[PDB]
Design a binder for this molecule. Structure first.
Ligand code: JBE
Lengths: 204, 215
């Protein structure tokens, strides 16, 4: 049974929304719980100058101290990360404890991850080559890709269902043929063509 | 101003778009409207899916229901976005491109996809873009819709290489010091160090970006 703790300054964003079949426990934590000042400050100007802000190490350090254990896998979504793939989702789906640290894309002070890595496994990962303001949406994607793999190539080609004719377009007759070896071969070719057209990187 | 309509059988799930988020609505730069696909059903049990022709696992969303929905929501100026693992890649360039659009409609699908005729039909009157946000599988297009909205909206007027490590105060923490060059005020040496750190991180984490083989 899996535990997922998410830490964010936008807890409402990650409020689950009604799969509660008691398979996984997901807890969301407001990062401001661990701030030190009356202003509940979570970021500060970057050393070396430049735009935006960097999230404070003292605040994140306290949060992870309380939430993480030696058994924890710490997930840090960031555009500067290793790629998050289906292989990753599969690996993480058998973990007991995931902690996802959501930060603004300018980043969390690197000493946070570096320190955590001396006591637990840390994975900095990117869900894609685009920039988001913060890690929250990436966290939703990771949570969904991982949890759907918990009990309870080529591209896929087009799919079809009833009715057999709709707005002048017929379902490919082969799909209604009852020749299942031929259907497989047809689907294989559709996958080849679609992969060539949309994702030539997948063919080498 | 921009208009985004999202069509889904899980409307409440597109609540994370709301107030305390970059998803901008409050500043009146975009209006985001979420529609329950089941609004366009007519049968008692509000059915939106059916078993696939030709066999296979799962269900396929019916064309009839999606057709009526898109008839009501789209115009010929609409950019129809269909998140799918079989889509063209959604990239930063895509985000910049869509940031200048007047009207995005995002069709969120579940099970094993939407009957292909829906996208084919729509393309006879509007521009259609089937896209993938990444090489992982989600149950449905909803989370991908949130990602796309976040990536696009932060580029709207009025709102290469990997970024290396960043630091802020204090300059020493748990016996770990900020790199001294970052404290030196030498803009040229700081730029050089950051450039270097970025290329070290890219070669390690994303060698593909520099034209090398992936692990
Ligand atoms: N692409 C991203 N942008 C911001 C935060 C996280 C991200 N990611 O890909 O995991």
């Amino acid at each position: 049974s899996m535990k997922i703790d998410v830490v964010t300054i936008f807890p409402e964003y990650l409020q689950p929304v009604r799969i509660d079949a008691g398979l996984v426990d997901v807890a969301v934590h407001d990062l401001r719980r661990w701030t030190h000042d009356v202003h509940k400050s979570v970021d500060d100007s970057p050393y070396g100058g430049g735009p935006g802000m960097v999230m404070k190490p003292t605040v994140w350090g306290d949060a992870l101290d309380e939430i993480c254990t030696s058994e924890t896998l710490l997930v840090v979504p960031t555009p500067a990360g290793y790629p998050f793939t289906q292989e990753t989702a599969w690996q993480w789906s058998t973990e007991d404890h995931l902690v996802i640290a959501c930060g603004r894309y300018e980043g969390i002070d690197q000493r946070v991850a570096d320190d955590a890595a001396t006591r637990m496994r840390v994975r900095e990962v990117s869900i894609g080559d685009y920039v988001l303001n913060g890690g929250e949406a990436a966290a939703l994607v990771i949570i969904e890709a991982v949890l759907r793999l918990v009990p309870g190539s080529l591209l896929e080609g087009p799919s079809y269902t009833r009715p057999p004719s709709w707005r002048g377009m017929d379902v490919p007759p082969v799909l209604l043929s009852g020749d299942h070896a031929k259907i497989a071969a047809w689907r294989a070719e559709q996958s080849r063509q679609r992969t060539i057209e949309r994702r030539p990187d997948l063919l080498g």
